[PDB]
Amino acid sequence: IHNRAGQPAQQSDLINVAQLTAQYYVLKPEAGNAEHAVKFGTSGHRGSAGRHSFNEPHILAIAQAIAEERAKNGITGPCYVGKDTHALSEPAFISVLEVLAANGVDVIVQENNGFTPTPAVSNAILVHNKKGGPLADGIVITPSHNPPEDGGIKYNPPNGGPADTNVTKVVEDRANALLAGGLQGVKRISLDAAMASGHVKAVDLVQPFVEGLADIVDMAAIQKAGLTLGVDPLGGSGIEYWKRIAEHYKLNLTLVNDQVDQTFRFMHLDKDGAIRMDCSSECAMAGLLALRDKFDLAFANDPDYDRHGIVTPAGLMNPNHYLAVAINYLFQHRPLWGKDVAVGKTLVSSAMIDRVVNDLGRKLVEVPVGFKWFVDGLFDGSFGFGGEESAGASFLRFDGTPWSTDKDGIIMCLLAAEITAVTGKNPQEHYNELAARFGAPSYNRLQASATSAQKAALSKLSPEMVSASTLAGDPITARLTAAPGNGASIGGLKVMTDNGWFAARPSGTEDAYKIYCESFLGEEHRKQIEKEAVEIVSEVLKN
Amino acid sequence: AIHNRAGQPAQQSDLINVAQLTAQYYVLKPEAGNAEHAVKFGTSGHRGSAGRHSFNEPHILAIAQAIAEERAKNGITGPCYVGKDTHALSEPAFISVLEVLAANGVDVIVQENNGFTPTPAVSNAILVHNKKGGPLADGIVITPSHNPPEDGGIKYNPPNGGPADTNVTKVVEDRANALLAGGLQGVKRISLDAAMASGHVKAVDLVQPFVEGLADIVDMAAIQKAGLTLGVDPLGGSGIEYWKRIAEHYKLNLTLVNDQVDQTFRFMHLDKDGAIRMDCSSECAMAGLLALRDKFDLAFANDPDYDRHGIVTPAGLMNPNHYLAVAINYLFQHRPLWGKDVAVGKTLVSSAMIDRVVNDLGRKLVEVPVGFKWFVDGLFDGSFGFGGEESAGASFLRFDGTPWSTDKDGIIMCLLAAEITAVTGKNPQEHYNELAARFGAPSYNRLQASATSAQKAALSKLSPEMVSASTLAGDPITARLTAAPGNGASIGGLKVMTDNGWFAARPSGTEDAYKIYCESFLGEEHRKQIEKEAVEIVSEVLK
Numbered sequence A: 001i002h003n004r005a006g007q008p009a010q011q012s013d014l015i016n017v018a019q020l021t022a023q024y025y026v027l028k029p030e031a032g033n034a035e036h037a038v039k040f041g042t043s044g045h046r047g048s049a050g051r052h053s054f055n056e057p058h059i060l061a062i063a064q065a066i067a068e069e070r071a072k073n074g075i076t077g078p079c080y081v082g083k084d085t086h087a088l089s090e091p092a093f094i095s096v097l098e099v100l101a102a103n104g105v106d107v108i109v110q111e112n113n114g115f116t117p118t119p120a121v122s123n124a125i126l127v128h129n130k131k132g133g134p135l136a137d138g139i140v141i142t143p144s145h146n147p148p149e150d151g152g153i154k155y156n157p158p159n160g161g162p163a164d165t166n167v168t169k170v171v172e173d174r175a176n177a178l179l180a181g182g183l184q185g186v187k188r189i190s191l192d193a194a195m196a197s198g199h200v201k202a203v204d205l206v207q208p209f210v211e212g213l214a215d216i217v218d219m220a221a222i223q224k225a226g227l228t229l230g231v232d233p234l235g236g237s238g239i240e241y242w243k244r245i246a247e248h249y250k251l252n253l254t255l256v257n258d259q260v261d262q263t264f265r266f267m268h269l270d271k272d273g274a275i276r277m278d279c280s281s282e283c284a285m286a287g288l289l290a291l292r293d294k295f296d297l298a299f300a301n302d303p304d305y306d307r308h309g310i311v312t313p314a315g316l317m318n319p320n321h322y323l324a325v326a327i328n329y330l331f332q333h334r335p336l337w338g339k340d341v342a343v344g345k346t347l348v349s350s351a352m353i354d355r356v357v358n359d360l361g362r363k364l365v366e367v368p369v370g371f372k373w374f375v376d377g378l379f380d381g382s383f384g385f386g387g388e389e390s391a392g393a394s395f396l397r398f399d400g401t402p403w404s405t406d407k408d409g410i411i412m413c414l415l416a417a418e419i420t421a422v423t424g425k426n427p428q429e430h431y432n433e434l435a436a437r438f439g440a441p442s443y444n445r446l447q448a449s450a451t452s453a454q455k456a457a458l459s460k461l462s463p464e465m466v467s468a469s470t471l472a473g474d475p476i477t478a479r480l481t482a483a484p485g486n487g488a489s490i491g492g493l494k495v496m497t498d499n500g501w502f503a504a505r506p507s508g509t510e511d512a513y514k515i516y517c518e519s520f521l522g523e524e525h526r527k528q529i530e531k532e533a534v535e536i537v538s539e540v541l542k543n
Numbered sequence B: 001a002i003h004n005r006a007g008q009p010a011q012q013s014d015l016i017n018v019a020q021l022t023a024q025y026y027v028l029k030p031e032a033g034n035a036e037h038a039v040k041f042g043t044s045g046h047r048g049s050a051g052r053h054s055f056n057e058p059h060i061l062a063i064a065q066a067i068a069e070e071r072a073k074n075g076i077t078g079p080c081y082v083g084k085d086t087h088a089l090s091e092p093a094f095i096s097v098l099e100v101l102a103a104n105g106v107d108v109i110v111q112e113n114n115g116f117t118p119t120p121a122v123s124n125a126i127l128v129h130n131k132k133g134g135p136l137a138d139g140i141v142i143t144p145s146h147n148p149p150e151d152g153g154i155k156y157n158p159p160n161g162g163p164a165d166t167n168v169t170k171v172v173e174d175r176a177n178a179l180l181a182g183g184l185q186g187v188k189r190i191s192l193d194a195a196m197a198s199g200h201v202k203a204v205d206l207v208q209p210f211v212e213g214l215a216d217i218v219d220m221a222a223i224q225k226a227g228l229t230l231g232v233d234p235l236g237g238s239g240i241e242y243w244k245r246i247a248e249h250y251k252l253n254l255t256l257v258n259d260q261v262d263q264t265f266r267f268m269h270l271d272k273d274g275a276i277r278m279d280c281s282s283e284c285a286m287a288g289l290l291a292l293r294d295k296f297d298l299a300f301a302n303d304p305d306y307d308r309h310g311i312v313t314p315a316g317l318m319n320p321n322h323y324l325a326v327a328i329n330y331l332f333q334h335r336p337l338w339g340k341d342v343a344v345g346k347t348l349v350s351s352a353m354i355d356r357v358v359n360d361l362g363r364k365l366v367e368v369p370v371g372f373k374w375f376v377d378g379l380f381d382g383s384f385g386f387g388g389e390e391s392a393g394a395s396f397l398r399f400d401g402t403p404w405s406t407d408k409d410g411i412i413m414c415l416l417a418a419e420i421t422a423v424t425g426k427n428p429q430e431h432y433n434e435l436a437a438r439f440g441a442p443s444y445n446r447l448q449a450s451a452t453s454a455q456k457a458a459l460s461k462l463s464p465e466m467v468s469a470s471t472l473a474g475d476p477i478t479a480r481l482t483a484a485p486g487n488g489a490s491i492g493g494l495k496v497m498t499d500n501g502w503f504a505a506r507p508s509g510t511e512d513a514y515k516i517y518c519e520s521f522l523g524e525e526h527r528k529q530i531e532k533e534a535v536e537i538v539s540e541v542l543k
């Protein structure tokens, strides 16, 4: 979109790292300013020190709220605290240790101030808790693929996955209460006191994760295939993980750069001209894509390593296409998974998944947008796979027990290699065969502004408020305001025919709504769905 | 001194974690009673690193309060120009300085848009301000010069524009340490936001008046007319914007070989000892520009504070002593407005080629101890036309015989090399060959080794008569000095001279070592004989 989309970042594009880090300490949120408040949701709290939305007082307040909340839930084991490669993860990490140790909380960290992927934290929690003693949980310090100036912090309970809204709303309220009270009632000691306390233990989390990969992906088959693999670590938290994977499993796996740089200067600019480490963006992935002819398969991950991008000589795979291929493969190549093991899908993901799951005779569980809906099912092994169209997924170990109950970018990348090794066809070739079999669907997302009134309207709709009988030439077969799979409110509307669908829901961050549309007939028909979706939305939300 | 990895490009493993280092500034403290963590505020101010508890918020708060007090006690009531270089720790130090000075009621002038400012641009701004004849300005320079990326520095320039002398620095050091010992009670401080809102901080462009003023010190017209192809390696330092503005304003064919600013300094080639040091006088650090030396008539580099200079021609990196001699020989023949009384300042460990040039010109040579502070008074009142140190630092007067910068100025020294080439048709290296023909071709070297502290102390307080040897390397000893001939200040060691050569010995400031500087006009073999006898004389006089 933007003029400089896909261009190499320039010096003028870059943050002053030390200045931003200083701002964490020297700038504060304005009392009574809602934009500076803690907003702690499914992906935790994100902001920037320079915008007064990610500073020492936020992290102090959040850390205190988490300490109290976990105690309230009888969690007495260690808290695994991992951080990504964003600048603001460094001071936030120190603040967390200061508050947790002050509250009597044992902490486990990566040794040598190293970095830890979100799924490595999830996996560490699960492995710890399998042993049946005091329960471990985790904090992940990352704003995912947000620009270099942003910081993030989120909480993972003992089930290893993202905290649900019952926990996050309590943490939010408590953190904001603490902020309004000028941090009195935040307990804190110095970093030196925290290190002397005996609460902080440094371990290597890399080695147990990497060695454990044989229990989830067929690494021997990958090795024996002798594929030429490439990875762009994109300066993220799993850079050391990829190196160790290549060594330990003897893979022909090349890191196309090994840079860690808190300005992320090696990046190509994203579609809106910002530096964004989005492994699913063709603009951001421009570096790896210029080299796609040099590998059988290549991949990238966002900085927290919970999302994935798959590259073949054909280009960057669309996330929906890869989800369908991964599901089709896994459920035919996992003999130990029980007959009851289901497929979790968000309702805005491609109906190609529906086609695949129905074909396998498997149970499809459609849920609202969000990975949180998969956590319980992955944890207890009733979901074999849960994915979202925004390129994040997870699946079970070979034996049908969880590996990571948060999204895991590394197992998704390695799965692509397993698929290619085992079947002799890369995931793109598999998708092409699926398209020949079921039709090649055309998928698009739209967005426009909406005032809070219309945004709230769309949020609480009834199914029969749609005065539409048809959609792009076809009779309407379903009108949904709740997800078929778990019956949870979708916070919007989905409309289906035999040949396509659209779903509409408000945005979390901006005053806007989004429309997802797909046609199994093609682009022209999809464009017709788009037009009618806009008309239906503007008519349903006109009052 | 020369490591396996000298001259190699820095690797990811060589780099600091900038945000972690910056956080340490705020979260780590100097330890009560540890001399290593104390303020050590001397000739080039106080330097250290946050990760070693020697450059942290308490140090800078203490030093800034001590500076505010000292300047007030001396009746300095105008603004304080506060400039910073591109090291990471310069950013939190800069904020601490603003917080304390604004709290103390000091008007601060800073570079707009959080820009960087060379040391000589601070000196120049002070001098230009004070010529207007109102309340006196002074300045603070936040830089540890060419020290590695993890280091921080801060120093004070009084209203004479130059480095503070021992009388000032001793009082600042003692007060800062008293403030630290008292837990920073009696440091006045306000928040960064309050400082900004107070009206005490004024952001201006210091670049333009410096750049425009250059025509009053160097013959920029002659340079433009010669149409030289010039190159610059800014080495990620504070003057990057200055070189760009100079090329634009004066219409020069001047190319920056890279414009990287990176607080890890990852673009650097490693120095002689395999560390990252931004030393414009090191062939190893300069490897990048040297590889390009055939592309330019002349090329320049500066250290990060831009008070030192490196001059490159197709023949390589010019020896700093050689260039001093050439600059002096040129200036005193090409500056008709300078009075007959105007003298030449030289540190007494600089080449005796300077003595011979100055003698030939019929000028007064003023030999001073190590330390540029010994030239400030003379440059300020115009009685010194030039002051130079063998460590690649010099300054000289404007055309009219008034001062430009009373600190060392790397920019004018680089531009002077272009003037010489443009005016005479011969580059500075070619001029040196003519000097060697008139005076002999000296061979100069520096030695180091360990000594006990008693020996190190004893070295400082020797007598001349105490060197019983009457001959140095074949020739009669003509002088034995314990004090500088030009100003009588103690050299803190010994210099022994003959008609054909000399040596000087002095304790290292930092290490448990002594240094010997040796030079012969009879050549390398003779110089090595001086070396041998110097080591023997030193050993003999030091029990």
Ligand SMILES: [Mg+2]
Pocket: A144, A145, A302, A303, A304, A305, A306, A307
């Ligand atoms: Mg992510």
Ligand SMILES: [Mg+2]
Pocket: B145, B146, B303, B304, B305, B306, B307, B308
């Ligand atoms: Mg310097």
